[PDB]
Write a protein that binds this ligand. Structure first.
Ligand SMILES: *[C@@H]1O[C@H](CO)[C@@H](O[C@@H]2O[C@H](CO)[C@@H](O)[C@H](O)[C@H]2NC(C)=O)[C@H](O)[C@H]1NC(C)=O
Ligand SMILES: *[C@@H]1O[C@H](CO)[C@@H](O)[C@H](O)[C@H]1NC(C)=O
Lengths: 249, 52, 61, 81, 154
């Protein structure tokens, strides 16, 4: 359970002389904060087993910056064994608190994928032209998980695959779709707005796709900025299931 | 005389349009320059011919 | 057409005729849509919103 | 050139001879618990259909696939219209 | 038939967890309806919420996982709770097997615009309670495609 950090020059491959900290406690999750140190090293945060947070390089400037920006940092830990999701805040004094918590019962559903959208992507067109000389706004939530769980019932006729669009900050489940009579393995891609998860259909014995597109109203709610705490309008979901005539890897 | 005058009148614009068509075929698929003012979206099909 | 002072008024009539064409131009716009009046033509002007709440993590390590 | 696959339980399975040199058409095979088993053409749409194909799968190839796309190479006759 | 679920709230100056009983949820599994029976806020709770609102704190809700086997919880900006005239909606998400999955609380309208709120406003719990069962996703449409292609062929 003990985790270690190895710092190296990615060009030459040699370990950097900066001794990485010794992660004494087992860790659960890690974050690559976009904040950078003076030497343009992106701050990295680790959450240990005692739910404490260890920064790196964790200098005074780094400590100050992330202590001053603490309440805007949220972790989410997905315990697949218990079917639990937890979301923790970041206190000023480098401590975490139980912000939100959900439990998907492992007795009927086991979490199999927690695919979130890539952090290093951009969206060019915030909205899309719907014709009519009108625009339909995409539901660009940057803190949107796409937790996909399988049915613990392995029967070919009663199996199902659930997909929950749980938020990453407030813990709100935007969508809780459950496709019946389907079985894994499921290969899901999460992008700017849409998600696409391939699966097996036991009833008809055929690999099937299912594209979920998230759209807002004809007019954007909060423009200037997006906050997961300021989205009282549940985004509309567009779904479509396609047939894939082959397997997938 | 009518054919000659019609051809002379035609040769003032038609060569230009034919050169434009030939260029469009020859240089299809590029992005040459960015116009420094925000043109309307409705002008897209003709400004960006050959771009997907 | 400046035979008398009415030319000035005549000029206005000429302008009115031009105005008529301008009116048709508006109709032409309504018939072509080649005018940046709708929100769609403003789509390219929308900068992406900044993220306000940061959330990371995932499956238990 | 023949092939044999062992350890197959009852059900429906799509058999495909994967080969980068020459493609092969997939064929569905329905084997029952009792032992009788049959072959047919796969169809993910309207799966209820049956187009029988002999069981000793004679999956003759259809030549090398077409991974590549030829150059356009438009001529002046294309420029004409 | 009907199951009662506890529902606690918490809001403090230090934004810690001090969940206290607020309302009972009567989830009738047969007809799939949920009804809450909460007590109105008191002066100290209103006062406590005022400093929490003043300090831009959070308002956290918590219910037991089962009708003490666990809890599912969420939070909402209490200042956004108070700037919305205590108008919010809590959605109860369950699974296909009829097990509690999560609780989501959101105000109406969301966010904040610095609107000062008097105490008298906070003597009512404008709370819209909904239950969200997992929505079955639609499968691929084949009948339309086969019939349409049949018409095309003929
Ligand atoms: C609780 O507050 C919400 C938000 O103010 C109320 O919802 C409004 O209802 C009116 C009609 O009564 C609509 O015109 C508004 O658009 C609604 N606002 C929304 C949805 O944000 C709601 O009626 C209040 N009461 C209850 C019991 O839910
Ligand atoms: C978005 O919400 C904030 C409050 O969270 C508000 O101040 C702002 O005016 C809203 N709209 C935009 C476009 O930022």
């Amino acid at each position: 359970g003990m985790s270690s950090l190895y710092v190296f020059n990615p060009i030459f491959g040699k370990w950097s002389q900066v001794a990485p900290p010794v992660l004494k406690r087992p860790i659960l999750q890690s974050l690559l904060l976009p904040v950078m140190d003076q030497d343009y090293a992106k701050v990295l945060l680790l959450i240990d087993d005692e739910y404490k947070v260890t920064a790196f390089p964790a200098t005074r400037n780094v400590l100050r910056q992330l202590h001053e920006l603490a309440p805007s940092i949220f972790f989410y830990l997905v315990d697949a064994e218990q079917g639990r999701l937890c979301g923790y805040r970041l206190r000023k004094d480098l401590t975490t608190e139980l912000s939100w918590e959900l439990t998907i019962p492992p007795e009927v559903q086991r979490i199999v994928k927690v695919k979130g959208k890539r952090s290093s992507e951009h969206v060019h067109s915030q909205g899309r032209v719907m014709g009519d000389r009108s625009v339909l706004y995409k539901s660009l939530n940057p803190n949107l998980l796409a937790v996909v769980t399988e049915s613990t019932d392995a029967h070919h006729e009663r199996t199902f695959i659930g997909i929950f669009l749980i938020d990453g900050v407030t813990g709100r489940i935007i969508h809780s779709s459950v496709q019946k009579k389907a079985k894994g393995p499921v290969h899901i891609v999460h992008s700017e707005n849409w998600v696409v998860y391939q699966y097996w259909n036991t009833k008809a014995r055929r690999n099937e796709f299912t594209v979920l597109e998230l759209y807002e109203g004809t007019e954007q709610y909060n423009a200037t900025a997006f906050s997961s705490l300021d989205r009282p309008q549940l985004p509309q979901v567009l779904q479509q299931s396609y047939i894939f005539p082959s397997s997938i890897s | 005389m009518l054919t000659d005058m019609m051809k002379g009148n035609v040769t003032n614009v038609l060569p230009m349009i034919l050169i434009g068509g030939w260029i469009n075929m020859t240089f299809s698929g590029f992005v040459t320059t960015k116009v420094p003012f925000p043109l309307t979206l409705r002008f897209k099909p003709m400004l960006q011919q050959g771009i997907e | 057409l400046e035979s008398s002072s009415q030319k000035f008024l005549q000029g206005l009539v000429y302008l009115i005729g031009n105005l008529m064409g301008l009116a048709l131009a508006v109709y032409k716009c309504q018939s072509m849509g080649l005018l940046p009046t709708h929100a769609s033509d403003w789509l390219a002007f929308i900068e992406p919103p900044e993220r306000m709440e940061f959330s990371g993590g995932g499956l238990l390590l | 050139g023949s092939f044999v696959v062992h350890d197959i339980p009852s059900g429906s399975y799509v058999v495909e001879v994967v080969s980068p040199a020459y493609r092969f058409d997939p064929v569905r095979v329905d084997i029952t618990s009792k032992g009788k088993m049959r072959a047919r053409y796969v169809n993910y749409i309207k799966t209820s259909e049956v187009v029988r194909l002999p069981y000793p799968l004679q999956m003759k190839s259809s030549g090398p696939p077409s991974y590549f796309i030829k150059r356009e190479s438009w001529g002046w006759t294309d420029f004409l219209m | 038939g009907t199951v009662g679920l506890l529902l606690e709230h918490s809001f403090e100056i230090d934004d810690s967890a001090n969940f206290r009983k607020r309302g009972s949820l009567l989830w009738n599994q047969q007809d799939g309806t949920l009804s809450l029976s909460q007590r109105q806020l008191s002066e100290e709770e209103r006062g406590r919420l005022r400093d929490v609102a003043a300090l831009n704190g959070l308002y956290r809700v918590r219910i037991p996982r089962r009708p003490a086997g666990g809890y599912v919880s969420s939070f909402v900006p209490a200042c956004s709770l108070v700037e919305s005239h205590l108008s919010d909606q809590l959605t109860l998400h369950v699974d296909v097997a009829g097990n509690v999955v999560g609780v989501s609380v959101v105000t109406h309208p969301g966010g904040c615009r610095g609107h000062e709120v008097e105490d008298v406003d906070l003597e009512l719990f404008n709370t819209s309670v909904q239950l969200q069962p997992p929505t079955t996703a639609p499968g691929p449409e084949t009948a339309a495609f086969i019939e349409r292609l049949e018409m095309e062929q003929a």
